[PDB]
Write an enzyme that holds these catalytic residues in place. Structure first.
Site, mmCIF file in Angstrom:
data_model
loop_
_atom_site.group_PDB
_atom_site.id
_atom_site.type_symbol
_atom_site.label_atom_id
_atom_site.label_comp_id
_atom_site.label_asym_id
_atom_site.label_seq_id
_atom_site.Cartn_x
_atom_site.Cartn_y
_atom_site.Cartn_z
ATOM 1 C CD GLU A 164 -3.089 -1.456 2.142
ATOM 2 O OE1 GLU A 164 -2.555 -0.880 3.275
ATOM 3 O OE2 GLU A 164 -4.020 -2.129 2.069
ATOM 4 C CG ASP A 223 -3.419 -4.165 7.819
ATOM 5 O OD1 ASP A 223 -2.729 -4.526 6.704
ATOM 6 O OD2 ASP A 223 -4.119 -2.983 7.696
ATOM 7 C CG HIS A 233 -0.272 -0.524 8.122
ATOM 8 N ND1 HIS A 233 -0.013 0.149 6.796
ATOM 9 C CD2 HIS A 233 -1.528 -1.153 7.834
ATOM 10 C CE1 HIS A 233 -0.972 -0.369 5.882
ATOM 11 N NE2 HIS A 233 -1.766 -1.049 6.484
HETATM 12 C C1 LIG Z 1 -9.167 -5.346 1.777
HETATM 13 C C2 LIG Z 1 -9.246 -3.915 2.655
HETATM 14 O O1 LIG Z 1 -9.214 -3.204 1.494
HETATM 15 C C3 LIG Z 1 -7.897 -3.787 3.074
HETATM 16 O O2 LIG Z 1 -6.764 -3.599 1.998
HETATM 17 C C4 LIG Z 1 -7.630 -2.734 4.086
HETATM 18 O O3 LIG Z 1 -8.098 -3.119 5.190
HETATM 19 C C5 LIG Z 1 -5.989 -2.237 3.931
HETATM 20 O O4 LIG Z 1 -5.628 -3.385 5.163
HETATM 21 C C6 LIG Z 1 -5.934 -0.886 4.810
HETATM 22 O O5 LIG Z 1 -4.878 -0.993 5.691
HETATM 23 MN MN LIG Z 2 -3.231 -2.722 5.192
#
Ligand SMILES: C[C@H](O)[C@@H](O)[C@@H](O)[C@H](O)CO
Ligand SMILES: [Mn+2]
Ligand SMILES: C[C@H](O)[C@@H](O)[C@@H](O)[C@H](O)CO
Ligand SMILES: C[C@H](O)[C@@H](O)[C@@H](O)[C@H](O)CO
Ligand SMILES: [Mn+2]
Ligand SMILES: [Mn+2]
Lengths: 591, 591, 591
Positions: free
Chosen positions: B337, B361, B528
């Site tokens: 991400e 996460d 995170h």
């Molecule tokens: C599937 C979700 O969009 C997931 O990508 C999110 O929870 C993502 O972890 C954001 O941190």
């Molecule tokens: Mn994430």
């Protein structure tokens, strides 16, 4: 000309301005309060130089601006350095407070009911804090009757602590620091910071190259008759230790005399430079007779002077002592290696106690494991958790031997006005003068060796300048300890046997740098420290708050910290409130 | 290509400059101290890339400015990124210290009596603090004999902790962070702060739009021979999980093989972008062969890429692992991400340990009451006070399964140079590749599902940028826990069964955010975190102090915090001294 | 014209923007969350004026910038003063958060597994802190099922605390503080700081010289009918006390009626000045009928008005009470001696609880030794450690008698909407009106004497302005105590028997200013304080963080401090994080 206009304490009796019987029924009690406060101060306090402390009272009680202004006019011509405002009733806050931004100020509100002096106290302090001019609060614990004229013990303690610190501040203002020489072997504190002295302490710095000391000696710019008297005194009283130099460097009697002679001249000339000497006018040296108005000095010494001339051991030891060939006197403040920051800690200690100060190298931390390994003794008592070896490189005030005694008969260090010639001679008798080690001090010299008696309460301090923060103060209260002869000898011959020793054990708190003895050593901010007799950390803390110097390390009880009431607005935390308040207010004199 | 000049460690032997036998008697012992230091470092330390650490020693002992200058000349041409000044005697403070304002510096003074090295230590540190160039202190607890040449355990620990952190700092300097994509779903850390990288870490930021990944894949800008090999390896080793798209959004038409092929290509291209690939020159893509000199990267992924192309789960899992089709290697640092702040935490962890880092996460806090309500089991052991569910959205370094073993046979994660082919295979065997959930990842993909073994000590960290304050670091040491089979399934199916899981229990202290497990979760500053093997909070704290990043939260023992000596001047409080010192000194490279 | 657009609470339902099933399956649950939140707030909260609180919900769920913008447009025209963003799933952080820099904002993330709302919470909060717009976090302790629609107790408590404090902030915005007169007896708080009101509170200051009150009285600029009614009410209900004045000053009959008549008029005119009065427009005094839109006021009184006209005791006591001749009503906030800083503390307390506030002089600290000495009774119970005498100089809200009762029958102070006529009369019956002491108040007056019932929990606060730091808040929770009839009389006669009394015992913590009762007194930053019913320290702390006013002193449990999440990034220490954060963010409206 001695007693060079000592600072005075101004007492401001404040009162409710309204009449119809009110003000007039309070007049007598208020002025009595003012008179009682002055009586106590002049009785219990002395300037470090020995003189009695003088107080100046307002011609009238102060109820508003007209009266406050009159009082101010009177004070400014009387050289008052600090003020104490007293009252037994409600008064008009901002119209009556002392507005001077630099002098230390305190307010004592009588704790009574018909006499709500504490209500004014709180209101006045609020005005002080709102206007950026912090002031100390003196509020007694127990309620007193309107007719009670005695001063409670808790109130007395705060008044004395405030005045003692306040006087110290006022006494430094305007005086000089004499830098005799420059940087000594890259020691940070010997890189004299002119701005620190001027902005924080209100002092000036006079720099003099060491060739000037050489000139006074070679050109006979000294009292020749005094020299003969100093030599006679040395001959009659000096006990010599053994020469530990390699055989080729040992000096014959003639050469040893030339060293003793020059060493004593150094003491004389440095003293003359600090405070002046009228006798110099007699020999055609009128400019030199004036002195530099120095209240503290530093002598560079190494490497440039000492690689060819006698070292400053004797001079430093004598000048820092409370006596010499002329009898007992107030000790001077001369920092070895021109370490001005240690000089400042010594100045503070002396102004607060009137006693001689011990300059020391924080040389070794001896863990109990290390002690056991090298000597076999499993240590106990004050030394149970470790011990710090404090030995200056050749000099220390002879008072440091702790041969003086107090009322109860205990070993101690006292203000010069309480030292008898007998005690002075005892200190000299407990000292052995040993030849300087040639490879380090090529011109020779005589070190003052003594062993400080154990069981004596001491306060170790140090001021350091941290770029981006400014100056900070470190404090460590503890005791000197006595080691069994056998152990002391093992450690002493392994370190520097010809130097003065003090075995120190800091009081542990279990937290921060005071978790154990190793941490106290590891967190010291320089290789030098100053020892002041007794447990005076609380005094250093109050003094530091007046100068806005943060205390980055101390082991003083939280209940004993006394600072301007504005510090509390900066937080409940004793350290946080201090860093925040100091950053807020800044140095006393500028920037 | 590779080994592009690694930073070296400079060792500066400092000595008393005077002769007459003094210096000449200390020369050998001083150089031996330097040599012993160099020997210990090159033996116990390795660069994260696996290479041995090289030390450069001054040609002569340093006693003053002329020699200090000669040493500096030698060091600057040898790429030294940190120095350690060693000495067994007294030396001239400001004339011998390392004046470089940016490189990490330490001073080790021998704790001896005839050898007063610690006296120099305290003086030199005072000069460092007065001159605004903080340095670390290395002082041993117990006194050593003048002839003792061994390095005590406590001294070794400090030397290694300083060097390890200093190398991390020196290794990041000059490198790039590769931002592949931009902001991912409004996640703050993906709004890459170019100034933070440049001023605090001394790095550069290379932004590349994701259409560039598409170009490399579509125009075949990669090694076709290598792709064949990757697929062979995948076929031969990949264990597949059950697909869960309600028997509708599955790939029965064989788009499955296409997804796998593309996923592996993503891993290859990203890697090539980071460090370059000479093979690309063979096929005419010379510009592309150079790479971006990136030491860390982030892949945006959602929403724009993943709504049409295979997600980055496979590439991220492989790249962050210590192995792939080409054998074991140093793991790369690729943040999912494009969360650059988690990437920075990963970079730090990797530079400090040489191990693979786990991106996670911080999904759910499970209170003991919540556990009992949903599964019936009243939990005990490490999980007794609650538990935190750490699951990254599809990828995690395969090393995270903790299938590797240490000497004592315990589950662990090791530096790549200690990982055997057998262990790599065991990690792959503990992983199941599950198809990505279509509704979220329309382009498909393969997630790496594994369960981390319980009872492993871990350190969770996170770097956040606070406007008006700057960057801050959070640390939480704890352990992975093992839940009974019946319980794990209830919770896992209820959350995201196709994602890698790690059940985490932080060590509680009873104070602040560590009063209970809920508080640890509640005070985390982002969604995170990064998991680094072992309890390395102390290393993170030392590293943070070198970069002036305040540690806003941590559960490391006060005795283990090791920072430049200047920090103590800012206060006895571990937190207060940090915020004050960091604000004072600021970022290492600019502003 | 009354109900002058009360602020509303905006509720923002945030959601995953992706379709193909995701968003559509979450729509209903997300809006229900929003509706459940609105229902709870409107049901459990009331504006301090008695009105119900209204919530405005976004027209649609917010998943990106277009929808976020739409919501903002709707809110800005509906006068929403604070927002609560709710969500049961993952959403796009920076694209969905409330960007308004001044309004209080909170985010509640549902604590579920299939519903990862807590994951968005942490992400959004990180975006808020990175962008310098702090927000509060509402995260429940225990995991909830996706179908569970109830709001847990812990979540409810945080929602209410945030809303209550947030409403207080929004209510003060734009209103005026009426300074009736100027500085009263040099009291710092009476030197009204216009910038403080404007920048921190977003209020305006209206200054009016006291000759204006004289003009309204002399020129009959008031409701003559109402006055007749006020006098009737006074005649029928007022219980009078012993006249303590010297006989030559005791005024009788005619004069006494004149003092009463004028005292009631002062109450009427001051009230009319604060909120306007249409009846004045009827009599041709239109400008005066408008009022000054004042939500709080201060009356100088001494020395200038009181040296010739009746004092403000009666006006202040009545206006600050929850009733008068017209029945029960919302109490006004009128500071005696124009102490604006105490006015502000009263304003905060009233906005937070909707109850009457007690203005008090922190008059005496009675140590147990002092009590024993003067009365003979050795004390226990709440008063065991000392006691603080709180007595305002003549006035106090009659509600302060604590004659009102709660459900359980205990003495208390309640929001005006819960006060019955029977309770109002009971409070008046517990009050005796005593003539003012002539030498202090030459114009006469009537003091409200009552004794507050013991055992009632109270919160004492004070705001002070510290130059170079800004405003700071002080809090001290405790209880009123009941002293045996014999002891109370000794102390009361000895102090000021004609004034309202409250014996207060603060809860000790053993640390800092709360080591003992003396320390609480010694660290109070002014001579005045405000008493608010109950233990509402936690509310004051939350409110202060919204206004960026550091809490320099408090005895509230660490677990009860609730501030924007960004505070944690400034440190684990409850005090350090506060001073650091407040300095960072600064006042809410300017500079
Ligand atoms: C599937 C979700 O969009 C997931 O990508 C999110 O929870 C993502 O972890 C954001 O941190
Ligand atoms: Mn994430
Ligand atoms: C003899 C040595 O040079 C000695 O002078 C040093 O240890 C000195 O104490 C530095 O502080
Ligand atoms: C009667 C006194 O002037 C009285 O008004 C003062 O004590 C007043 O409370 C100041 O706060
Ligand atoms: Mn020295
Ligand atoms: Mn008052």
């Amino acid at each position: 000309m001695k007693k060079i206009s000592l600072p005075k304490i101004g007492i401001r009796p404040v009162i409710d301005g309204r009449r119809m019987g009110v003000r007039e029924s309070l007049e007598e009690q208020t002025m009595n309060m003012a008179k009682a406060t002055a009586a106590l101060l002049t009785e219990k306090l002395r300037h470090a130089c020995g003189a009695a402390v003088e107080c100046v009272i307002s011609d009238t009680c102060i109820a508003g601006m007209a009266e406050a202004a009159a009082c101010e006019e009177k004070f400014s011509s009387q050289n008052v350095g600090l003020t104490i405002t007293v009252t037994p009733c409600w008064c008009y806050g901002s119209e009556t407070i002392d507005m001077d931004p630099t002098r230390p100020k305190a307010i004592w509100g009588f704790n009574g009911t018909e006499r709500p002096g504490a209500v004014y106290l709180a209101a006045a302090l609020a005005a002080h804090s709102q206007k950026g001019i912090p002031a100390f609060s003196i509020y007694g614990h127990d309620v007193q009757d309107a007719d009670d004229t005695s001063i409670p013990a808790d109130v007395e303690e705060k008044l004395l602590r405030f005045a003692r610190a306040g006087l110290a501040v006022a006494s430094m203002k305007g005086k000089s620091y004499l830098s005799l020489g420059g940087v000594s072997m890259g020691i940070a504190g010997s890189i004299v910071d002119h701005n620190f002295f001027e902005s924080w302490l209100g002092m000036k710095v006079q720099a003099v190259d060491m060739t000037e000391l050489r000139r006074r000696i070679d050109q006979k710019i000294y009292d020749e008759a005094e020299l003969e008297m100093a030599l006679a005194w040395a001959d009659k009283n000096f006990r010599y230790g053994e020469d530990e130099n390699n055989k080729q460097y040992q000096r014959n009697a003639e050469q040893s005399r030339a060293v003793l002679r020059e060493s004593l001249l150094m003491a004389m000339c440095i003293r003359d430079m600090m405070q002046g000497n009228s006798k110099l006018a007699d020999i055609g040296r009128v400019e030199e007779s004036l002195g530099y108005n120095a209240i503290a000095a530093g002598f560079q010494g190494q490497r440039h002077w000492t690689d060819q001339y006698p070292n400053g051991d004797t001079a430093e030891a004598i000048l820092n002592s409370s006596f010499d060939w002329n009898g007992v006197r107030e000790p001077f403040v001369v920092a070895t290696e021109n370490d001005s920051l240690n000089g400042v800690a010594m100045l503070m200690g002396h102004q607060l106690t009137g006693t001689a100060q011990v300059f020391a190298d924080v040389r070794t931390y001896w863990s109990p494991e290390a002690i056991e390994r090298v000597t076999g003794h499993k240590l106990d008592g004050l030394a149970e958790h470790g011990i710090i070896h404090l030995i200056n490189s050749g000099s220390a005030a002879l008072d440091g031997s702790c041969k003086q005694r107090d009322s109860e008969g205990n070993p101690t260090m006292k203000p010069h006005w309480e030292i008898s010639q007998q005690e002075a001679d005892a200190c000299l008798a407990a000292t052995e003068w040993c030849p300087a080690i040639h490879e380090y001090f090529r011109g020779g010299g005589y070190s003052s060796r003594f062993l400080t008696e154990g069981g004596v309460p001491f306060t170790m301090t140090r001021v350091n300048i941290i770029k981006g923060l400014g100056p900070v103060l470190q404090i460590a209260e503890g005791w000197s300890v006595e080691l069994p002869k056998d152990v002391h000898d093992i450690l002493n011959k392994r370190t520097n046997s010809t130097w003065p020793t003090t075995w120190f054990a800091p009081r542990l708190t279990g937290k921060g740098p005071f978790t154990d003895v190793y941490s106290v050593m590891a967190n010291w901010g320089a290789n030098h420290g100053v020892l002041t007799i007794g447990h005076v950390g609380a005094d250093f803390i109050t003094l530091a708050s007046m100068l806005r110097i943060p205390v980055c390390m101390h082991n003083v009880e939280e209940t004993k910290v006394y600072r301007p009431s504005a510090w509390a607005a900066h937080g409940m935390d004793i350290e946080g409130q201090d860093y925040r308040a100091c950053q807020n207010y800044g140095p006393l004199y500028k920037r």
